[PDB]
Design a protein around this ligand. Structure first.
Ligand SMILES: C=CC1=C(C)/C(=C/c2[nH]c(/C=C3N=C(/C=C4\NC(=O)C(C)=C4C=C)C(C)=C\3CCC(=O)O)c(CCC(=O)O)c2C)NC1=O
Lengths: 172, 162, 162, 172, 162, 172, 172, 162, 162, 172, 162, 172
């Protein structure tokens, strides 16, 4: 995986060049905002359970065929794996938000997943909906103005949504 | 790849864990360090030519035979004198990369992994590069946590050659 | 355990490596977070009895049947009330420990590992402890990084239960 | 393993007690001097190979029977093992200096080592002597007032000597 | 799927062996037991609705708070009451399946695997279902080897919950 | 995997339904005749080596190209493998007869066996002929009015033939 | 391993002798009472969690040093392990009751368990008390004239007690 | 030792599981079968000498060369005839043991394991023993499930020899 | 396949090593031996018919019943005698192959692998083939290292049957 | 795998025939010139390092894009892999020369290599160049008339070139 | 160790096999080789002192700086020259051992294992030793198969150094 | 393991010396009479089964308590284990004869065997008897002057007797 730094480093390395002052300044700007970047990891992490369970509960409400007998999320063995997948996606998203790069989310979680759900008989299009709900909840939990210094996080909150959107696009 | 963030994640991941305050502390450390490290790499980048020429010259000084022995492992002609400067350049570039990553990761992936193999295979004496690194460490004119960190990668590269 | 220092060491040890600038950065983060966390644990230790008492009463308030139902797993008698208080005390103590260590390690080792088996074997509902933790979160009177970190641990325990 | 914190934490946990305010002040005291600690970690680490090789070279000069044919350090394999042992012992000490606790060094490196040297017939006595020289050189390296903010680091040095001494004592 | 026949085959197969008198004896035992088991499953199937409603009511009696408290995990609204009846129905149906199969296989595969995860995640108390099962056990009206076998599965489900 | 019971159970679970009384009565009727089933398991099993070796000898008698030098059954290693393939197929067939369902034979034996034989250069057709001979022999042995309580077991014989036909079909 | 049958067979084989008529009659007498045996297997098994948890709670009630901070059963990991040890011992005892021979319990559970507990620092005596409580509970459950065809099962109860005593003896 | 009870236990144990109705069914089958099995073993035991001598004679009839040829592997002297009667006796005794156990376990452990090695090394023809067994099978006089079970083991021994 | 060269290479390969003086010495041994070996293999090829017929006859002489007893495993008819002649032919040919390969490789790959299963399956006595091998060994008329190396393989085959 | 001997044997075996005298003649003929073969084995082996390093340097000099930043041989980790691939191929070729048969080079080395380099994005034809460069060096090393009994080694050199060509063709 | 005999035994042992003509051929090769090898080892021994000195002087000639540069890794003084001649002596003695053993085994176990680590650690340049060996090839004066085998080890040492 | 050469090498290496001409001369003596050495390996090997089976058969005739029911050689598995052990001992003996050094026989075979036979309850002093017969048969085979170039092999016979006696002593 890469992070915000090593990504640029590798990009520069395969050109055999040092980082320009512009790239460094960019990374510095990124550094100057990194408190808010860990507040979000903290906040999303601290609500992982309810995020997953609320998103899942809503998903099943809107799509009762998933939990109906014969449904892919019926039986407590598959429901657990379903909640598990949700939690995993969320986790890797938080990894992406933490690292400041999507590589960890792509390399490990998302790549090959559409095909996996295809093989299993899992509706990825439902997973994506789950991910969407998780996203909406996560961003709101993130944007909470209580118990934190006020400021702008419009940039970070867009990146996070970028990651969630990547996750969603990967299984649709 | 050894860097604070990528590591922290990779640690948490093999445990199947969300990131807790530990990794956040790692991150705080990284970002606090980055303010000096990035400036350091930025500075070093501007001094590349000087440091490389100086280093190569210091090597040629320490080991004159490298400028007056036949063979492709030596720098007695133009090609070799260019190969050497190239290599030293690579080393410095890797230092600047390490300062930016906040760890030895880039130098590990791009340079140290397989260094012994190269050096043994092409008859390049580590001592040649130890002198080049020793020069750079004593001429980069950095100060503060910039120097301390930047010199931790030079000494790390030195250790890798010893 | 899971703490910045011990993890930083264990990682490097697993790689058969000397500690680099990375581990140093981890440490740097730790020692600065320590300034708030160490005092946080202090404030929490000072308010131990009150927080535990209030939390237990909060549990009894939200789940009244616990003070009424007969059974070895309820606080309908003195025994059970002391059991409850004891457990909440353990939780709070673990939180302080996590603040001391700067990581979930203590709680993981002493409490989280096997909590599911315990709650299931002795018929203890996680919601009770979630409620206690909620009450403690809402009454510790902490602020700043102290509050954030402590609450990260509280939410972690709440997460381990849900 | 334990660090300076979890050591106290565990010792406290076995009693079922919160940390006493004094025990916490004691730790804040350590926190207040951590820059020096990491300075020595960096400093010893930065001269690992020379610290090892100097000590070894000098060890072999005082006890030439070790490298004499038939000696326990004759042949390049055993010599490599020997250097490796020196480096290992040196490493696990820096671990202890970094951690601020000797648990990792005793647990992972030293405990059971004299028995190893026993079954190998290796002269632990000479190993300790190696550790002594490494200690000396490292402490010399740490006390260098060049290129560093000056102040008192005597407590830390004293702590380091303890680790080196535990290493030296473990195999004697 | 743990059944006598499948188990017998699989043990025979894991040894690369033809079936012998051992597996034949297993089968004989199975088919002897099936005579009562199938009948039992029939009886329960016919008593399904009654047993379900009864068990649900018994749970509501034992834990009245489950009909008052708000929250998606409770039966204070019609939705939750439906979820409840559904779940209890699932349990009963699994018991019938077990009677049909002659083992815990169906219940294991369709229900037990991950029951802890589900109960923990959705905040459902295992004791509720234990109470439902204890009641089903009392009211199913079965007798003989039928009742003995059925109660074995009931108590198995109970053990899986405690 | 599936037996006569769990197959129906699995069919029922996907529909979220309990076994109908008819579905149960059928299984009861199967149970009523189980002694015969086990008698044939016993009879085929007890004659295993004879069935295999007779079928093999027949097969090689009618198809001498198999045992001629260069034939796929020539050399003792390939002859051994050949005999064992016969034995295996018979074994999994007895498993099918015992289980009351073809799932074991399908999933643990026949699945991917043709491609295997193709890759090897083994003529699956010959295998099928072998299985045919084994079917004939086994069924003749199952009937044998000697030393058994007399009765009708036509349906069972049909079922057995079914499993054998499955194998013979799968390999070619 | 050994059951009531193969134990005698093994005893007989070493003497190169066939079972005497008495040895057989004994086994027949054992067979005559096998329904009870399986009834108790069922009864203990069905009450597993209750037996274990009741015994545990009792044990911790009389021996609070075990669950006090620093006790070997303090912390949830050790409490879990403790509970499971109880469960395991009970399980292998039920195996012994089922098998009609103590060999399983001996060879697969108790053998080397004391040394294990010693190395761990676990007080085997407490384990034994736990097993004692489990014995009492189980035996009370086995008797229970409710919901069963009445008869005498004194010998069986004795045998069960024997197996429990074996465990309690082995651990301390 | 392959017996229904031991197998049941071991499968239960390999899964870390308490015994369930499955193993109970195995046991029921076993104990039902034992009623005839034990009796059978008794009968054979009482018919031992006769059956042994008969089988030996049948082998001598089928293969007369075994009573003429010199060599330690033949029965042309009294020694070999004793070895023969002994071996056949062993086989019969194993069959009785199998009847007692309810499985091939005893025969497997005491006889089958290494039978090829022994026959190959000492140059004993498997067909001799097959002939002995075929004869024992004809002359044992058993009937019902007794005979069926016994013949299962006889044919098993025969299969082990071919 | 077990030959000197192939084993040398396999050794070298399992160590990620280039062939050294060891494997070279192995090869030298092989090629020195092959001078007699190939000659031997050539010689035995010319004696095939007579050696096989004589061997078969020797077997028939030692074990007359094989020419008298009915059954697919005996040689009382033409069908049976041709199989025997063929088999002895296979053995002899394998010996030649071994002489050519300088090892038991060919015979191992083509004959020994599965010999027990085949002989055990079709009721073929190893003693017959041992007698045949003894005859071939006694009647081949080779000399020098030829006869010795050939006899090593003959005796090897003999041991493979004992 | 095969050598010069078992290759003919394994050919004759599938026909159920002994080797023709002409085959034995050819093999004896090969034996007559085996010293030369082992001379080339020794000679190529003895110059293993230079053969690879010279070719590598010569390859990089002619194709500077391979070692330029972004090139597949750039960085030390990949250069190592490249040199190692070269060495490996040379080794297996010498195995082929030693055995007198190519199958060891076919099955263990060149099998699948194309697709591997394909997956890696490695230029297999550049590997083919390298091999092309190692071949000529090897033959030059083998054809040296210094320090050896003079004689003719043409067919052998041809066979060597055959194997090298085998290697080159399999990666291109 | 890498020798014909021990490896011949090793492969046979890993197969669990009695030796055959293969290992015998290996042995024959080894013994045919030993006749020249032992002689070579002798000749080299009686010329040791000369070869080492000449080799040392050759190294000094090719790399003059090794006799001018201070530091313990160089031979600018007595001790260093002693170390050098010693090392060269060791290298030669390994060659003798290899001739005795019939393989690189001794040199492998006593010298090759860790040579990279030692050379890197003690700043010793492999080129020096390669030169020293190159001289020894030229000056050992051996002849015949004795010389070819000796050179194979020298070139093996060189390869290990490059 | 060592062979005759590397054994002397190791001794010389421990002292940092070159083989004295005397040692080389001795080795040359060993070389000179190595055709005999391999002749015995070949002869003994070529009669393995018969040596073992003869010794075993007569052994069971001297000591029938072994094969009597309850005896350690009773049952086919232990008879097979027994014959196997005899065969292993013979095999490693031949390895020693071939290697010209008993190290392989000592280390990989006879080491700890005495204790094993004790733990198992096997009478080692019967294994020794078994070996003492294989020896007698073995040198009888080796001393056979038929079909061989006559010469003296007393030294070698003595050496072989050494190894057999070695094996015999190592098990009692
Ligand atoms: C280990 C746990 C831990 C964390 C993670 C942490 C984060 C953190 N957040 C901070 C401020 C801050 N946090 C935010 C973030 C927000 N402002 C908003 O209104 C919203 C919605 C957001 C959410 C993204 C902002 C804007 C600041 C002020 C500017 C800045 O410091 O970046 C600061 C610096 C100020 C301070 O000392 O509190 C820290 C250290 N502190 C801790 O102890």
């Amino acid at each position: 995986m890469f992070d915000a730094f090593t990504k640029v480093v590798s990009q520069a390395d395969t050109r055999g060049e040092m980082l320009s002052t512009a790239q460094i300044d960019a990374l510095s700007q990124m550094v100057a905002e990194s408190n808010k970047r860990l507040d979000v990891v903290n906040r999303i992490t601290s609500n992982a359970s309810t995020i997953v369970s609320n998103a899942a509960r809503s998903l099943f409400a809107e799509q009762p065929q998933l939990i109906a007998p014969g449904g892919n999320a019926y039986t407590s063995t598959r429901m657990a794996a379903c909640l598990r997948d949700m939690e995993i996606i969320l986790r890797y998203v938080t990894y992406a938000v933490f690292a400041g790069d999507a590589s960890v989310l792509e390399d490990r979680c998302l790549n090959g997943l559409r095909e996996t759900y295809l093989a299993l008989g899992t509706p990825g299009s439902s997973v994506a909906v789950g991910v969407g709900k998780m996203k909406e909840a996560a961003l709101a939990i993130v944007n909470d103005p209580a118990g934190i210094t006020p400021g702008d996080c419009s940039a970070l909150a867009s990146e996070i949504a970028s990651y969630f959107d990547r996750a969603c696009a990967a299984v649709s | 790849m050894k860097t604070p963030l990528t590591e922290a994640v990779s640690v948490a991941d093999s445990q199947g864990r969300f990131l807790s305050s530990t990794e956040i502390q790692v991150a705080f450390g990284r970002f606090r360090q980055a303010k000096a490290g990035l400036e350091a790499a930025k500075a070093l980048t501007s001094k590349a030519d000087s440091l490389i020429s100086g280093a190569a010259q210091a090597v040629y000084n320490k080991f004159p035979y490298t400028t007056q022995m036949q063979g492709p492992n030596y720098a007695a002609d133009q090609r070799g004198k260019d190969k050497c400067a190239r290599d030293i350049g690579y080393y410095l570039r890797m230092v600047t990369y390490c300062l930016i990553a906040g760890g030895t990761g880039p130098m590990d992936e791009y340079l140290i992994a397989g260094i012994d193999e190269i050096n043994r295979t092409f008859e390049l004496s580590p001592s040649w590069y130890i002198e080049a690194l020793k020069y750079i460490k004593a001429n980069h004119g950095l100060s503060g946590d910039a120097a301390v960190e930047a010199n931790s990668y030079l000494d790390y590269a030195i250790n890798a050659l010893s």
